[PDB]
Design a protein around this ligand. Structure first.
Ligand SMILES: Cc1cc(NC(=O)c2ccc(Cl)cc2Cl)n(-c2ccccc2)n1
Length: 300
């Protein structure tokens, strides 16, 4: 998991420790149905898992036969994923290390990644549309997952809608399979970095922090309010990099009320220390999701 938030946390946290006691699933209890996605180092399948909770649907990541260091990384990642337990973090069920391929088992998120979900439920629908209340509920749930990660001093490093998943009844959780660099290659710039989601200190120094994650969340909000459009879509990577470092801001989306644009702007302060905390950003979004702004409302 080169440059993953999972490995970066293990490397950097001096108080972190974990024994090797992850939940093990017997290979015979996993029955693959069909492929969901493919990357350079793995494949993701939809599967049925017996004796897990009865017969239930899961997302299974299979590793393309790995070197000793790749197998050691698989183990490190599995231990940390066991620890990340939150209502808005994709649930990790365990591993299958008896025989090959090595498997990681996750809960199945039936509506797929949030970027595909937004694009298929918005204007000129990619093959019904999401209302403002639903867009705010999606934003508030990604914000809740980020509050949990910040509380652990866990830096995501790649927060974007492609790295969020959608389940039953509009449930949104942060989670990926580590293959967004292959599936969404145009969202990275070559060591591949998601520059369009990155603040100036991340581009300049490859510095990733809780504050760079807040900026990326501001970019996620803009993605949500444009129904999955790519930030700086009219520009090349080099022109986007110049916009970011020179202080150009993304425009207010048509579906975005001014009070919500103000939230994105608080995430986008060029000075990291001036960015709003994710706790405050989540509280305002949760309040708006339950009382959505109305165009031409009498405010007083
Ligand atoms: C290159 C790369 C990036 C990731 N994703 C994360 O590190 C990640 C996953 C989940 C959550 Cl909640 C937060 C984060 Cl930041 N992986 C990865 C490796 C093994 C398994 C699943 C993903 N690999």
């Amino acid at each position: 998991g080169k440059g993953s938030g999972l490995q970066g946390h293990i490397i950097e946290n001096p108080q972190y420790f974990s024994d090797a006691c992850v939940h093990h699933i017997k290979r015979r209890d996993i029955v693959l149905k069909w492929e969901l996605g493919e990357g350079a180092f793995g494949k993701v399948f939809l599967a049925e898992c017996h004796n897990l909770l009865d017969k239930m649907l899961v997302a299974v990541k299979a590793l393309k036969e790995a070197s000793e260091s790749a197998r050691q990384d698989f183990q490190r990642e599995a231990e940390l994923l066991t620890m990340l337990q939150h209502q808005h973090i994709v649930r990790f069920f365990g591993v299958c290390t008896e025989g090959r391929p090595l498997l990681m088992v996750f809960e199945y998120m039936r509506h797929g990644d949030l970027n595909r979900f937004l694009r298929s439920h918005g204007p000129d629908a990619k093959l019904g549309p999401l209302g403002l209340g639903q867009l705010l509920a999606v934003a508030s749930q990604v914000a809740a997952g980020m509050v949990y990660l910040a509380g652990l001093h866990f830096v995501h490093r790649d927060l974007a809608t492609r790295n969020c998943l959608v389940g039953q009844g509009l449930v949104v959780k942060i989670g990926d399979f580590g293959m967004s660099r292959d599936i969404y290659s145009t969202d990275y710039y070559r060591t591949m970095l998601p520059i369009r989601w990155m603040p100036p200190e991340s581009i300049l120094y490859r510095k990733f922090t809780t504050e760079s994650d807040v900026w990326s969340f501001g970019v996620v909000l803009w993605e949500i309010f444009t129904y999955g459009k790519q930030p700086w879509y009219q520009l090349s990577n080099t022109e986007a990099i110049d916009c970011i470092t020179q202080g150009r801001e993304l425009e207010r989306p048509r579906a975005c009320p001014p009070e919500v644009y103000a939230i994105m702007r608080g995430c986008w302060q060029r000075e990291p220390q001036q960015r709003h905390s994710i706790k405050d950003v989540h509280a305002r979004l949760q309040a708006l999701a339950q009382a959505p702004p109305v165009y031409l409302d009498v405010l007083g």
